Amino acid sequence: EYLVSPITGEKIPASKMQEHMRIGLLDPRWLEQRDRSIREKQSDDE
Amino acid sequence: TRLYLKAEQERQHNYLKDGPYITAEEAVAVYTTTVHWLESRRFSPIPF
Amino acid sequence: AKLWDSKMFAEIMMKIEEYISKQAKASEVAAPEYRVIVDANNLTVEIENELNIIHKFIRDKYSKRFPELESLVPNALDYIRTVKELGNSLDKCKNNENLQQILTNATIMVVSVTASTTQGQQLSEEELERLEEACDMALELNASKHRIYEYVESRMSFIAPNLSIIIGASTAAKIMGVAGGLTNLSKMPACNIMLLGAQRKTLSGFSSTSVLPHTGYIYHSDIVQSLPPDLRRKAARLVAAKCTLAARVDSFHESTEGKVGYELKDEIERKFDKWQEPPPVKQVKPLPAPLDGQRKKRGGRRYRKMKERLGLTEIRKQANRMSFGEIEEDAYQEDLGFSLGHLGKSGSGRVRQTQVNEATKARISKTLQRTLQKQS
Amino acid sequence: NVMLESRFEKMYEKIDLTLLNRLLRLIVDHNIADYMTAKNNVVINYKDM
Amino acid sequence: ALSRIKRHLLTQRAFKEVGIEFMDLYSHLVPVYDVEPLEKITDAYLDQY
Amino acid sequence: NIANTLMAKALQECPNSGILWSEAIFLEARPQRRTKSVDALKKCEHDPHVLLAVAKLFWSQRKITKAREWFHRTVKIDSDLGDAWAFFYKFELQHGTEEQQEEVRKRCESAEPRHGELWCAVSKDIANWQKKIGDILRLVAGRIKNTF
Amino acid sequence: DVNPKAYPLADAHLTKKLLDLVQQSCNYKQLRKGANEATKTLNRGISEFIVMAADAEPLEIILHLPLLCEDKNVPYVFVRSKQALGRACGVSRPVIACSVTIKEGSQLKQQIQSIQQSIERLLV
Amino acid sequence: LGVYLTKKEQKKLRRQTRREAQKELQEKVRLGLMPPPEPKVRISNLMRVLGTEAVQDPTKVEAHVRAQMAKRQKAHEEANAARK
């Protein structure tokens, strides 16, 4: 089946709808937070 | 504090496993004495 | 009357249906066996109803002798056994070896204590013999119920395979009998299955949590009891939901082998493993480095409110001012260090009394307001 | 004239909750007695213990 | 507050965990119990009554 | 089961029916007689048959004080209605004292505000109406035509 | 098609109205989610119709709902997707059974009768 | 057919859109595209933002504040009328 996106205005397969809503609104500041959490982790000493 | 709490856990487990340590005869004697005392003094129970 | 009519009904049921159940049980040692399961599930309900009637009659008859034991012993079968053992003679209540099995040691003290201060008069010979015959009938009905439950346990490998896979056939039989049969248990919501066979145990001084309220066969089943006590209500809920799913599957005789039963049992085990999983590695947060320099902080309505709440108040300004040379009498006995200062004492320069800054009022947190909304 | 001064060694730690509940029901409302004896049966906590 | 107190007296039989510390008198340990303030109000009113 | 289906259809088409709801209480099995069969029922209406049914349910649970309180409430809210007097008398004889039973019987005497149509209520509710039942009453010529 | 035991199975035109009315009832605090709550509503005699999905994994865990609906004289209809029913219920998780409940003075009453008539037309 | 995003999902979408617009404005102000925002002043706010200049020319300050208030109201009514 095919469904219209309430977040993107595009047609998507019905099987990917749950993941499409789950990752179509992944807040980009989450990616920023993960980036700054990994940048500090790499620079950490022993 | 840690030692006393470990001992208290042991004591509570002993009470739970071994049941009440007051025999029914002793409890009945205590309760009867209290009842007789309250009846003698004419004590009205404290209401809600 | 009602005691005799119930006896006639029990005899009529045992003559035909119980005999057929025994014959079907001993057969393996045009007359199918599914109808035998149906009429056995009817017998358990009939026996429960007539046992409730018998318990009502026994309680009514015994309220003349000991009118409190019904509240002290809430369970019907335990009440019947206790009234059978005690009877009119309450003198033998001391060191009742025969009562330790019927009642726990917590309520044995309660019944012994209450029996010493009971106003109920002794029964008569006719009342005693009627009560004894009623108790004997109740125990006979209980034995018949145990036999029919044994038969249902034997047949659960054939009637309810998925539900017997998820939970043991003993718990399977005990929930199927009390629910009124496989169809009635499958038409029952998952929240009502966990409460099947939940005896309203009377809290004997102890808290309600110690008595484990709202607990049934599922909770006391083998898989749920194989969990730490802090993780047993969640296990009971999950097992009840999966058992409801399995029962709904079985009521239509689908998945006879038990593919759905295993597909649910293995995910139950997976959830149990996930709950008991060791906690992951969490990095220790080091203390923040000591801070030097200037950091710009905003100001506004929030900052103004915070400063008003935290800033010095006039009465709290007078509190930390002590007159020089004017020795004051000690105010608070428990703490001699405590002193009002210029508050209420001459020399403060204020003719009128300082008023309370209402911005420093103490009030509950936001989340503590939420609890009050869930309490009233 | 003989005077005996003594103390009940572990009265606080040996007050049976069921017997205390009965003795309280003797003098106070059974709801109040049940509340008090249930309050005396709670989880004692300290750090990780 | 009085209505909440009476409701707790009637229907409340389960309570939250209470913390325990020990006052060190250097000769023995005196247990000290921290109860929830919401239950503390009810217990204090019950004691006074 | 067919009786249960018919009762479900009847309640759905005719809600707020005191007698229908009171009888539907006793169609349902004992585990579900309280939590769902009588709670939403008391939510729906407060018919004299409803209060009588609640008192009967409490009596079947051997809650004597609750049963007596609910029977007194039923009598106070509506007297000579729903034939509750027969059940009240039976319950008082079974559980209440002889003095209490005698007092209840005396209160069940014929009076315009209380138990004036007690026989009529019994005939209407308990279906005790008969061809000779009306003739047995004072209005032998009159109540016979009214009664079945 | 995919599931033969599913009956009655609503078509594309009807399932849109079913899901829209389910969402509207959710907005009016008139919807119950899950097979257990649908069963509870049917027992309590508060549901006027019941919807469920045709793609439940056993399909026998919501198959008692048609029997209970016939017992309680409540219309029932099946849809072809659990995820869409869950979304119409306002829940991210898939829902395989939803109930619409009787309310006093509700403004959804006319749509309720319209959908019940369509559901009855689907059966037989 | 169409799908209905849940209430939490609607809240997330609205919050993300508002944050996107806010970041757009902030980066426009950073690079000097738009003038930096002026403080929003109402009558009760007049003595906090324009306090020192409202003692010298009180009525000019009042007129400026009320002009700002009207312009804020002017844009709202203009948007409502254009959208209608």
Swiss-Prot record, chain A:
Domain observations: SURP motif 2 mediates direct binding to SF3A3.
Protein name listed in UniProt: Splicing factor 3A subunit 1
Subcellular location: Nucleus; Nucleus speckle
Glycyl lysine isopeptide (Lys-Gly) (interchain with G-Cter in SUMO2) crosslink location in chain: 16
Domain of life: Eukaryota
Function in brief: Component of the 17S U2 SnRNP complex of the spliceosome, a large ribonucleoprotein complex that removes introns from transcribed pre-mRNAs. The 17S U2 SnRNP complex (1) directly participates in early spliceosome assembly and (2) mediates recognition of the intron branch site during pre-mRNA splicing by promoting the selection of the pre-mRNA branch-site adenosine, the nucleophile for the first step of splicing.
UniProt lineage: Eukaryota, Metazoa, Chordata, Craniata, Vertebrata
Tissue: Ubiquitously expressed.
Modified residues (Phosphoserine): 5, 43
Subunit structure: Component of the 17S U2 SnRNP complex, a ribonucleoprotein complex that contains small nuclear RNA (snRNA) U2 and a number of specific proteins. Part of the SF3A subcomplex of the 17S U2 SnRNP complex which is composed of three subunits; SF3A3/SAP61, SF3A2/SAP62 and SF3A1/SAP114. SF3A associates with the splicing factor SF3B and a 12S RNA unit to form the mature 17S U2 small nuclear ribonucleoprotein complex (17S U2 snRNP). SF3A1 functions as a scaffold that interacts directly with both SF3A2 and SF3A3. Identified in the spliceosome 'E' complex, a precursor of the spliceosome 'A' complex.
Swiss-Prot record, chain B:
Transmembrane segments: none
Protein name: Pre-mRNA-processing-splicing factor 8
Disease: Retinitis pigmentosa 13: A retinal dystrophy belonging to the group of pigmentary retinopathies. Retinitis pigmentosa is characterized by retinal pigment deposits visible on fundus examination and primary loss of rod photoreceptor cells followed by secondary loss of cone photoreceptors. Patients typically have night vision blindness and loss of midperipheral visual field. As their condition progresses, they lose their far peripheral visual field and eventually central vision as well.
Coiled coil (residue ranges): none
The gene coding this protein: PRPF8
Subcellular location(s) of the protein: Nucleus; Nucleus speckle
Subunit organization: Part of the U5 snRNP complex. Component of the U4/U6-U5 tri-snRNP complex composed of the U4, U6 and U5 snRNAs and at least PRPF3, PRPF4, PRPF6, PRPF8, PRPF31, SNRNP200, TXNL4A, SNRNP40, DDX23, CD2BP2, PPIH, SNU13, EFTUD2, SART1 and USP39. Component of the U5.U4atac/U6atac snRNP complexes in U12-dependent spliceosomes. Within the minor spliceosome, which acts on U12-type introns, interacts with PPIL2 and RBM48. Core component of U2-type precatalytic, catalytic and postcatalytic spliceosomal complexes. Found in a mRNA splicing-dependent exon junction complex (EJC) with SRRM1.
Tissue specificity field: Widely expressed.
Parent sequence residues shown: 780 to 827 of 2335
Superkingdom: Eukaryota
Swiss-Prot record, chain F:
Residue windows of the HAT repeats: 62-94
Tissue expression pattern: Widely expressed.
Mod. after translation: Phosphorylated by PRP4K during spliceosome assembly.
Lineage top rank: taxon: Eukaryota
Subcellular location, record wording: Nucleus, Nucleoplasm; Nucleus speckle
Signal peptide coordinates: none
Function: Involved in pre-mRNA splicing as component of the U4/U6-U5 tri-snRNP complex, one of the building blocks of the spliceosome. Enhances dihydrotestosterone-induced transactivation activity of AR, as well as dexamethasone-induced transactivation activity of NR3C1, but does not affect estrogen-induced transactivation.
Assembly description: Identified in the spliceosome B complex. Identified in the spliceosome C complex. Associates with the U5 snRNP particle. Component of the U4/U6-U5 tri-snRNP complex composed of the U4, U6 and U5 snRNAs and at least PRPF3, PRPF4, PRPF6, PRPF8, PRPF31, SNRNP200, TXNL4A, SNRNP40, DDX23, CD2BP2, PPIH, SNU13, EFTUD2, SART1 and USP39, LSm proteins LSm2-8 and Sm proteins. Interacts with ARAF. Interacts with AR and NR3C1, but not ESR1, independently of the presence of hormones. Interacts with USH1G.
Protein name (database record): Pre-mRNA-processing factor 6
Included range, full protein: 794 to 941 of 941
Curated annotation (Swiss-Prot), chain G:
Record bears the keyword Ion transport: no
Protein family: Belongs to the eukaryotic ribosomal protein eL8 family.
SUPFAM superfamilies recorded: L30e-like
GO-annotated molecular function: ATPase binding; box C/D sno(s)RNA binding; RNA binding; U3 snoRNA binding; U4 snRNA binding; U4atac snRNA binding
Domain of life, per lineage: Eukaryota
Protein name per Swiss-Prot or TrEMBL: NHP2-like protein 1
Residues of the site described as Interaction with U4 snRNA and U4atac snRNA: 57, 82
Modified residues (Phosphoserine): 118
Spans annotated as Interaction with U4 snRNA and U4atac snRNA: 32-44
Keywords tagged on the record: Acetylation, mRNA processing, mRNA splicing, Nucleus, Phosphoprotein, Ribonucleoprotein, RNA-binding, Spliceosome
